[PDB]
Write a protein that binds this DNA or RNA. Structure first.
Lengths: 111, 186, 56, 50, 102, 123
RNA sequence: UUAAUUGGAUUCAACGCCGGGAACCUCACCGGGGGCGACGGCAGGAUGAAGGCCAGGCUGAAGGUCUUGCCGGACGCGCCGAG
């Protein structure tokens, strides 16, 4: 089609298992080897905004997430180890690493 | 595992009890530990100068000694014995300790070489040395050597054939490190 | 209400960060794990107990 | 030790029920009634108003 | 009779045929036919450590070595003979392993 | 409950010595409730067939409806002058200003002579 | 240069050296969330906990924090000597 995966809405129904194929080794790897309970609470935060009971905005220090569709269209405050940097999630960012999107320093050539 | 590695996995347990015993038996005076290890049970014969603080008041130390070995040891049937030290001067680990008592008092370096270098040699020895690293109660680091007989010699032979004791003698100004090396006759 | 709880939950189960020595309490030296569980500073003094020999 | 907590009601002559009683702990332990949700202080539960 | 392989590993040079020609003494309480001690290799363990904690500049690191020296003895005898040998094995010094086959 | 402001009957001492040993025998029978709040429930719901109460129970958050409640409920209440005398004889070992025995299956002898002495003379 | 790039070593006698394990750990350093002080002494004790807790509102996690309603049994915070 277009974008990363196919139509954003259609992908949500598919979610589990099917996403794996489209993306690299990393995203397959995270989902297959479980998570930690601190991550699992964040899964609940995202879920309440995209549907159902009242929103929780997603705060996270973790940069270990791999973007899922339910994260699209929402603003995630990720700690890079200094401060929180807001990130708006696009459909082009599905399957792509959280840590990429926020700089963890001000990175310029040295001079 | 292997039968090459069965001298690295019994020998370590012997190391562990030598380090803990020497410290907690300065109430009695320590000298050695003859540990005889059989699969039946580990029979440790503690050499100590005073028998009455290593048996306790009513088996007060005896309960401590039963409970200690079992953590360390794979043998869950320890027996305890106390033998007496019957020549404090023959052994280098009761002259390290005897010299440490005299230093902790303020009895100077030469005034305690009366009884740890003119008494040890009377007992019999091919050689003895006392070395005393520290600052010598100063503010800068210095050492002094006292030597009698053969106990340093060419090669490893006759200097790694010794009886060997180290003690700590604590000062309020520092630490002084106490080496007494007796090489028994032989 | 009440004072918080907190507990030790660091993933020390892999790497140098998992290891420790029973004889000096630390693992900041270059550790050895095959055989004995001790370090290089507890094998300068330990080695001829265990029948390791100095000579070559 | 203490200070300061009571939330037990006092009746005269008669008996009243302040709250619901846990069915997992028998009587003794009283549920907090928020609307539809039950709390239990004895062990700590998440409970819903059966 | 029952065949026993007594495999005897020792850290000492002179405790190895002194308990492999005088473990024939321990062993024999009934009749026995015994194989003279067959030397197996020295299996060699090295462990090399730095004696330097700082490591700096030029340095000399201690290469250690423990050589564990193996003799294998076969004996064909009763249950009682085998038992004598596994009843006592001193402080070790001498590791004694026993393998049992008919 | 009680207060030293509130006297309603006089507790004979002969009864009182054996009513601080009554609590102890009957603690390992069933349920034991202790502390003033706990004793409130034990009468509220009417579990206990005897409450024992030291006079020092304060403030009047507890006292409002509770002194008639024990009489209607048909249980005696018997006084200890101190909570450090109901706190060192009753089982409990840190002062208790009231305790309630559920099940006098083992203090039945003692605890029936209270209900015909501090519930005869005046309830 | 960066929030920080943790510290030492620094001619021989510092620079594949402690680091012959450097994603969190390691780790000392940095950033944000919470929090303990023994053993005696000191006012306090049952006038209920130091511990616990639904549900949303908030935390990277913890009734932790709030609104809100509620339990089981009973000694330790705070500090001052001094670990």
């Amino acid at each position: 089609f277009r974008y990363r995966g196919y139509t954003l809405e259609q992908l949500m129904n598919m979610s589990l298992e099917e996403l794996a194929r489209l993306f690299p080794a990393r995203q397959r790897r995270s989902l297959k080897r479980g998570l930690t309970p601190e991550q699992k609470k964040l899964l609940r935060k995202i879920r309440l905004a995209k549907k159902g009971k009242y929103k929780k905005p997603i705060r996270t220090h973790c940069r270990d997430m791999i973007i899922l569709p339910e994260m699209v269209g929402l603003t995630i405050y990720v700690h890079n180890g200094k401060e929180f940097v807001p990130v708006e999630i696009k459909p082009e960012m599905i399957g792509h690493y959280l840590g990429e999107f926020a700089p963890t320093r001000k990175k310029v050539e040295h001079g | 595992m292997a039968i090459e590695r069965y001298f690295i996995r019994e020998a370590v347990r012997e190391m562990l009890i030598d380090e803990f015993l020497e410290k907690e038996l300065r109430r009695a005076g320590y000298g050695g530990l003859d540990i005889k290890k059989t699969p039946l049970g580990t029979k440790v014969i503690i050499f100590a100068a005073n028998p009455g603080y290593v048996i306790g008041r009513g088996g007060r130390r005896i309960r401590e000694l039963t409970r200690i070995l079992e953590k360390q040891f794979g043998l869950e049937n320890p027996q305890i014995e106390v033998e007496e030290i019957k020549n404090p001067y023959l052994n280098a680990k009761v002259q390290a300790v005897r010299l440490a008592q005299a230093l902790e008092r303020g009895i100077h370096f030469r005034r305690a070489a009366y009884a740890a270098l003119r008494a040890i040699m009377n007992n019999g020895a091919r050689g003895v040395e006392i070395r005393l690293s520290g600052k010598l109660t100063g503010e800068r680091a210095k050492s002094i050597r006292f030597y009698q007989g053969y106990l340093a010699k060419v090669g490893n032979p006759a200097e790694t054939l010794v009886s060997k004791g180290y003690a700590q003698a604590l000062l309020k100004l520092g630490v002084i490190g106490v080496k007494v090396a007796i090489m028994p006759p032989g | 209400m009440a004072k918080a709880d907190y507990n030790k939950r660091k993933p020390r189960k892999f790497g140098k960060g998992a290891r420790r020595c029973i004889r000096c309490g630390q693992y900041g030296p270059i550790i050895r794990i095959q055989g004995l569980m001790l370090c290089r500073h507890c094998f300068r003094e330990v080695a001829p107990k265990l029948g390791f020999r100095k000579y070559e | 030790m203490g200070q300061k907590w009571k939330l037990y009601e006092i009746k005269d002559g008669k008996v009243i029920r302040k709250n619901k009683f846990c069915p997992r702990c028998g009587p003794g332990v009283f549920m907090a009634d928020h609307g539809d949700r039950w709390a239990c202080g004895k062990c700590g539960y998440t409970e819903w108003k059966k | 009779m029952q065949k026993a392989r007594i495999k005897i590993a020792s850290t000492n040079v002179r405790s190895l045929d002194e308990v492999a020609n005088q473990i024939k003494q321990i062993a024999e309480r009934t009749g026995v036919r015994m194989s003279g001690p067959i030397p197996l290799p020295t299996k060699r363990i090295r462990i090399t450590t730095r004696k330097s904690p700082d490591g700096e500049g030029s340095a000399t690191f201690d290469r250690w070595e423990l050589r564990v020296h193996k003799r294998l003895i076969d004996i064909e005898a009763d249950e009682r003979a085998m038992r004598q040998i596994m009843r006592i094995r001193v402080p070790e010094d001498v590791t004694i392993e026993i393998e049992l086959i008919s | 409950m009680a207060k030293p402001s509130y006297v309603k009957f006089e507790v004979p001492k002969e009864l009182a010595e054996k009513a601080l040993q009554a609590v102890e025998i009957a603690r390992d029978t069933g349920k034991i409730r202790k502390g003033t709040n706990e004793t409130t429930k034990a009468v509220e719901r009417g579990q206990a067939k005897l409450v024992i109460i030291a006079e020092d129970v304060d403030p009047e958050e507890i006292v409002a409806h509770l002194p008639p409640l024990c009489e209607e409920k048909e249980i005696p209440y018997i006084y200890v002058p101190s909570k450090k005398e109901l706190g060192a004889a009753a089982g409990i070992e840190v002062a208790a200003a009231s305790v309630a025995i559920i099940e006098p299956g083992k203090a039945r002898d003692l605890v029936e002579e209270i209900a015909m002495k501090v519930k005869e003379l005046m309830k």
